[PDB]
Amino acid sequence: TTALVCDNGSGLVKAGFAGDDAPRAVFPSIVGRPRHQKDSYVGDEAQSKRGILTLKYPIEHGIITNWDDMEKIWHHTFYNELRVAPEEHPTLLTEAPLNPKANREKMTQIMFETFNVPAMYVAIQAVLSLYASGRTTGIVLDSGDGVTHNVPIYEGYALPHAIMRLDLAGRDLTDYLMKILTERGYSFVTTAEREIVRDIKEKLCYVALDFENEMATAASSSSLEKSYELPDGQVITIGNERFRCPETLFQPSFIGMESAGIHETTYNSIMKCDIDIRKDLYANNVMSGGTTMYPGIADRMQKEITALAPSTMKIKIIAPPERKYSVWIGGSILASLSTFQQMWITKQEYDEAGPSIVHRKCF
Ligand SMILES: CO[C@H]([C@H](C)/C=C/N(C)CO)[C@@H](C)C(=O)CC[C@H](C)[C@H](C[C@@H]1OC(=O)C[C@@H](O[C@H](N)O)C[C@H](C)C[C@H](O)[C@H](C)[C@@H](OC)c2coc(n2)-c2coc(n2)-c2coc(n2)/C=C/C[C@H](OC)[C@H]1C)OC
Ligand SMILES: Nc1ncnc2c1ncn2[C@@H]1O[C@H](COP(=O)(O)OP(=O)(O)OP(=O)(O)O)[C@@H](O)[C@H]1O
Ligand SMILES: [Ca+2]
Numbered sequence: 288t289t290a291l292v293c294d295n296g297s298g299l300v301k302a303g304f305a306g307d308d309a310p311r312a313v314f315p316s317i318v319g320r321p322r323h324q325k326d327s328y329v330g331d332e333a334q335s336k337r338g339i340l341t342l343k344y345p346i347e348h349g350i351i352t353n354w355d356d357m358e359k360i361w362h363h364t365f366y367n368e369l370r371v372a373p374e375e376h377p378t379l380l381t382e383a384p385l386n387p388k389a390n391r392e393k394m395t396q397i398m399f400e401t402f403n404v405p406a407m408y409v410a411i412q413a414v415l416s417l418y419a420s421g422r423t424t425g426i427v428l429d430s431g432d433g434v435t436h437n438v439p440i441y442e443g444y445a446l447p448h449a450i451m452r453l454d455l456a457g458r459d460l461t462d463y464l465m466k467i468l469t470e471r472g473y474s475f476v477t478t479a480e481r482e483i484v485r486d487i488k489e490k491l492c493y494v495a496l497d498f499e500n501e502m503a504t505a506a507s508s509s510s511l512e513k514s515y516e517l518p519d520g521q522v523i524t525i526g527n528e529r530f531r532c533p534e535t536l537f538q539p540s541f542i543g544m545e546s547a548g549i550h551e552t553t554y555n556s557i558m559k560c561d562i563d564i565r566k567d568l569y570a571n572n573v574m575s576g577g578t579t580m581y582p583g584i585a586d587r588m589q590k591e592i593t594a595l596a597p598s599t600m601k602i603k604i605i606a607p608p609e610r611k612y613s614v615w616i617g618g619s620i621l622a623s624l625s626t627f628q629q630m631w632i633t634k635q636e637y638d639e640a641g642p643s644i645v646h647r648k649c650f
């Protein structure tokens with residue numbers, strides 16, 4: 288009996304089989320319907336046929352907002368991407384920190400009534416990422432395509448009163464890179480061009496240890512410049528934009544947001560926790576999600592947190608190499624454990640108790 292693990296993000300779905308080291312399927316969280324031969328398309332195919340479709344993202348800042356399109360995503364995941372019959376597999380799903388109770392119930396109803404799963408469970412994304420690092424205590428910085436959270440976790444369980452949310456993440460960074468490249472004299476505005484710039488961001492951007500110092504290097508030399516061959520055949524050159532783009536995480540004012548940067552929100556989150564556990568959190572800052580993939584980010588975070596924390600505090604930033612998929616991995620591990628098998632919501636329990644069973648069984 289093989290459990291499935293489906294990690295639904297704002298930008299990407301990561302899906303596969305519990306016990307595997309990586310998701311089998313990773314595809315965009317998009318649903319397309321024809322503009323005025325199929326009635327709907329999902330993921331890669333929807334992207335490929337965009338010219339004749341209207342696209343929608345059913346998950347916004349980590350929260351499911353379009354339930355009909357979300358059902359389409361799950362159907363596509365089971366039947367087309369993984370090629371499984373969902374009625375044959377226990378299914379672990381993930382959710383954002385502070386996901387409303389009613390959303391959890393809707394997820395539960397759909398899984399049992401629409402897909403007829405034999406069992407299910409819903410876990411908090413950041414908690415899973417911590418488990419994937421071999422820890423049950425620490426503070427997670429989870430940053431994806433749509434949302435960023437700080438989530439302190441103690442002895443296996445999130446501390447909800449100390450969780451911080453920031454609606455600044457990868458899509459915002461892609462858009463800002465587009466803007467600053469256009470200012471350089473290139474032209475990136477269209478949808479095809481957004482996809483191109485996202486690739487540039489992922490290949491060439493990095494976090495500077497010191498922003499001003501690196502700006503000065505870029506102003507007076509070509510040493511930080513890299514080139515990129517566009518699909519249309521123009522080779523462009525990229526310099527300070529490489530580190531200016533993700534600098535926005537530390538200084539959101541670059542895109543006109545008033546928020547604290549990720550170092551300050553981490554600190555604020557720790558300070559909302561019991562004094563007895565803060566040292567444990569400071570020593571176990573774990574980074575998760577695609578927007579934490581920038582080279583240089585761990586060292587920069589070490590620097591910035593050290594400057595905020597008491598002078599004698601021991602601080603460690605952990606940045607696992609597989610952290611694009613840490614949420615999914617944690618789910619794969621959790622759903623594999625013998626101790627976990629009693630934690631599943633069963634179809635019998637659903638049939639008797641209804642969707643609210645999820646509140647009794649899922650932390
Ligand atoms: C039962 O759950 C309770 C509670 C009821 C739940 C509460 N909530 C859900 C709260 O919200 C919960 C508190 C708790 O116990 C969770 C435990 C965690 C999932 C986790 C469990 C441990 O698990 C852990 O400690 C996880 C770590 O395993 C190891 N062995 O140290 C992960 C590594 C550091 C990194 C990977 O090697 C690396 C990322 C990569 O390696 C190739 C990899 C990718 O995928 C995998 N590894 C993978 C997928 O499946 C597995 N690995 C697998 C499936 O089973 C296991 N491994 C078993 C490993 C033995 C571990 O102990 C060393 C395991 C017990 O501990 C951090
Ligand atoms: N090497 C990289 N450098 C910078 N960003 C990257 C890199 N790899 C992936 N990303 C970005 O990570 C994002 C996707 O990450 P992830 O899958 O963790 O997000 P999600 O789960 O879809 O979104 P969210 O968690 O915000 O709901 C995209 O914005 C993508 O461009
Ligand atoms: Ca995510």
Ligand SMILES: [Ca+2]
Pocket residue numbers: 538539540544545546
């Ligand atoms: Ca500011």
